[PDB]
Structure 1
Amino acid sequence: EEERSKVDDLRGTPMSVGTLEEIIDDNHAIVSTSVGSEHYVSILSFVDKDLLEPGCSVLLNHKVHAVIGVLMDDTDPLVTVMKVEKAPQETYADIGGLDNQIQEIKESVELPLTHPEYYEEMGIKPPKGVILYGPPGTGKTLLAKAVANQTSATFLRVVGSELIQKYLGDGPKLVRELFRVAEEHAPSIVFIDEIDAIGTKRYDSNSGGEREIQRTMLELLNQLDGFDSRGDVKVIMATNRIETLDPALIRPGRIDRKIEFPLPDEKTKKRIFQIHTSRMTLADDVTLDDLIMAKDDLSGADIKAICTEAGLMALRERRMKVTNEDFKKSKENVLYKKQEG
């Protein structure tokens, strides 16, 4: 009512947007705005003074440098990288052969949060995350378990050591903010895939050095260990080669669960071809036995790419049904690809 028509005359019309430097128990707050300016602000209104804390943005009324209201504005560089969303149409039911592998991780990710009643009454509580890996180049097949996880709660994916070591640091602080922002969005899932920090050869741009790289990773462990945060921000690690990472990383996490990705057998590969070709239309003469017999140590995306190139070649004839001669001639292209060099 009258207060809205009162306090507005004090702040307006012009006002500046500064930053909070430090607070004094005398209700005088020291503000800093562009460029390099200080002051004593004491206001009893709209505060919220305890939730502000130094290091946040505050308004400045021209007369005289008073803060009428609080502003939390994001935006921010890091907040942009977490969303959105995906909520992908794919599910954990579109993959097969890892049922024995997936059972434990699916359980472990749905162990907390959803289905809490048997979890909370048992008093186990293993909230250190999970650790993934496999050969030869998989780990995306383990990401095919992250899509099902993207269907539940909140998800964030941070991959590759380039985002830290491309320039000088400041080291982990880029990760340190990911922890806290995920705490503000808790519960959320943070997935990290292919950690090359110790496996990289040449750093990006001009930065050093091999041992500083290690120290930012070690501070990542203490962040992850950790002292002292109980929040999740559930963390999942994944890579191709676990031997590169130091055993110093395993005790803090993941001490309870780590999975290994086995190579698929004949029955699994048959399932894989089934799931991809479900949407595709194939000729009657295409058989699933000879295909998986001729292939040796191939993942889902390989049998995927051969079908993609079969349909691409079938587009030259503008045919939606891929014949077995076209399928085999297309298969020979990726077969010659891996066998050329």
Structure 2
Amino acid sequence: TKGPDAASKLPLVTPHTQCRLKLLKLERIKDYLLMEEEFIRNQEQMKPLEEKQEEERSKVDDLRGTPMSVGTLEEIIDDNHAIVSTSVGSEHYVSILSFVDKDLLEPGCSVLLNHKVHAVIGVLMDDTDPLVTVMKVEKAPQETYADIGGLDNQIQEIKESVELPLTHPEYYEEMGIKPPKGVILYGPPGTGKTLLAKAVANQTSATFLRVVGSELIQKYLGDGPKLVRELFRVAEEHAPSIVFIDEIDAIGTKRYDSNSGGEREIQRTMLELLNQLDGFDSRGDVKVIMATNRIETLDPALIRPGRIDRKIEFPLPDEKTKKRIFQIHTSRMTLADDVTLDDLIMAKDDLSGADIKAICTEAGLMALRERRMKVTNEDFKKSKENVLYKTPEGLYL
């Protein structure tokens, strides 16, 4: 098979005070990018290589004709005829021409067919419809485990699930435990589930596929399951890979007897997702990560030990994790010496990582209100109740 993807540039992020160590490293990166540009522009400047076979390729192209429609090879027959489905959904019993790679023909791979008198004239290993191409991550997110505060147990678990099998896995089969096929992160909103997925996609060595869950559902009949199948086929093809499906409850709700056609199609799409999850062996190097807020509303078959063994909990940050997050998000701020930040943490509340980030942003805004950028402690004091909107007083004492 082919190899993974998601190329990223240098981490940099060693200096941040803009002390020309940043400038020197960035100038080195820019110099290398310049040599990229110049080298390829020179290579295209002189590169005469074409024709050669020509005639045989010309006549095979004439045989193929123009245009050529792509379909899905649903089934094969004796090695001259096959069953191919056009993107509309109609499949036909067609013939297979000699110049096709009989080894490449398998149920599922896209086949180039003749526009008139349909007949398999080619195989496309890179169909990758625009949607599933979009779901594949190209530029790694700039966030990383340095940006994540706390969640040390969560980071440990996610790395033990998706990284350790990717890196040296000998511990797994040495203990004989099958690697955890699939992991579901869950917790209250803005705890860091999507942030952890970003950090995983940063420090990665596999094709990362970001999905929205609600993205899978498609209007046309059978488009949903077909897209799910395409996504997982791309995952296997570019294995090792990580398939992140954020907001799994967009489809993961409890399965109930469908009545309307649309609900039947949703049930079909989830059934196909579950079937694809079961399809690949856990020994395979393709893992899935599903994040959600309403874990209690998920179907209790998606989270079966035979399908998703692990269940990572993302609890609201503790006081030490709260101060860790505050330190992280205040790194780029020019805080004064009067600020302590301890009063905000000590206040018994339900701050989250998102809440703390917003508190820092609003403190910066309040400082900008006073025409300053040093950000006093009073700025944080105001910002805390500015962003934290909304037990009867002395009932409990």
CA, structure 1 residues 216+339, in 2 after alignment: closer, same or farther (shift >3 Å)? Answer: farther
CA RMSD of aligned residues (A): 5.0
CA, structure 1 residues 274+82, in 2 after alignment: closer, same or farther (shift >3 Å)? Answer: same
CA, structure 1 residues 117+39, in 2 after alignment: closer, same or farther (shift >3 Å)? Answer: closer
- CA apart distance, 1:272: 1.2
CA, structure 1 residues 49+37, in 2 after alignment: closer, same or farther (shift >3 Å)? Answer: same
The answer (yes or no) to whether the contact 2:75–2:82 under 8 Å persists in 1 is: yes
Structure 2 alignment gaps of length 5 or more: 1-53
Q: For 1:181, what is the secondary structure of its paired residue? A: helix
CA, structure 1 residues 179+273, in 2 after alignment: closer, same or farther (shift >3 Å)? Answer: same
- CA apart distance, 1:185: 1.3
- CA apart distance, 1:21: 8.8
CA, structure 1 residues 268+205, in 2 after alignment: closer, same or farther (shift >3 Å)? Answer: same
What is the rounded CA distance, in whole Å, between the counterparts of 2:239 and 2:104 in structure 1? 19
The answer (yes or no) to whether the contact 1:221–1:252 under 8 Å persists in 2 is: no
Q: For 1:243, what is the secondary structure of its paired residue? A: helix
Percentage of pairs with the same residue: 99
CA, structure 1 residues 113+195, in 2 after alignment: closer, same or farther (shift >3 Å)? Answer: closer
* Bigger Cα displacement from structure 2, 45-54 vs 102-111: 45-54
1:279 aligns to 2:332 (yes or no): yes
- CA apart distance, 1:112: 0.5
- CA apart distance, 1:155: 0.9
What is the rounded CA distance, in whole Å, between the counterparts of 1:238 and 1:203 in structure 2? 22
Q: Which residue of 2 aligns with 1:251?
A: 304
CA, structure 1 residues 177+273, in 2 after alignment: closer, same or farther (shift >3 Å)? Answer: same
Could you state the TM-score of these two structures normalised by the residue count of structure 2?
Answer: 0.66
Structure 1 alignment gaps of length 5 or more: none
- CA apart distance, 1:71: 4.8
The answer (yes or no) to whether the contact 1:188–1:234 under 8 Å persists in 2 is: yes
Q: For 1:282, what is the secondary structure of its paired residue? A: coil
- CA apart distance, 1:132: 1.6
What is the rounded CA distance, in whole Å, between the counterparts of 1:302 and 1:112 in structure 2? 34
Q: Which residue of 2 aligns with 1:12?
A: 65
What is the rounded CA distance, in whole Å, between the counterparts of 1:165 and 1:33 in structure 2? 17
What is the rounded CA distance, in whole Å, between the counterparts of 1:202 and 1:257 in structure 2? 21
Q: For 2:250, what is the secondary structure of its paired residue? A: coil
Deviations 1:196-228 (A, max 9, x none): 357879999996566774564345333323487
Q: For 2:346, what is the secondary structure of its paired residue? A: helix
* Bigger Cα displacement from structure 2, 39-48 vs 299-308: 39-48
* Bigger Cα displacement from structure 2, 33-42 vs 221-230: 33-42
Deviations 1:233-281 (A, max 9, x none): 3112222232222333333455542222222222221111111111111
- CA apart distance, 1:305: 0.8
CA, structure 1 residues 206+146, in 2 after alignment: closer, same or farther (shift >3 Å)? Answer: farther
CA, structure 1 residues 150+166, in 2 after alignment: closer, same or farther (shift >3 Å)? Answer: farther
What is the rounded CA distance, in whole Å, between the counterparts of 1:294 and 1:133 in structure 2? 25
Q: Which residue of 2 aligns with 1:44?
A: 97
Tell me the number of residue pairs that the alignment of Structure 1 and Structure 2 aligns: 341
* Bigger Cα displacement from structure 2, 30-39 vs 137-146: 30-39
Q: For 2:233, what is the secondary structure of its paired residue? A: helix
The answer (yes or no) to whether the contact 2:75–2:83 under 8 Å persists in 1 is: yes
- CA apart distance, 1:151: 3.0
What is the rounded CA distance, in whole Å, between the counterparts of 2:381 and 2:89 in structure 1? 71
* Bigger Cα displacement from structure 2, 311-320 vs 183-192: 311-320
- CA apart distance, 1:311: 2.3
CA, structure 1 residues 340+146, in 2 after alignment: closer, same or farther (shift >3 Å)? Answer: farther
The answer (yes or no) to whether the contact 1:172–1:216 under 8 Å persists in 2 is: yes
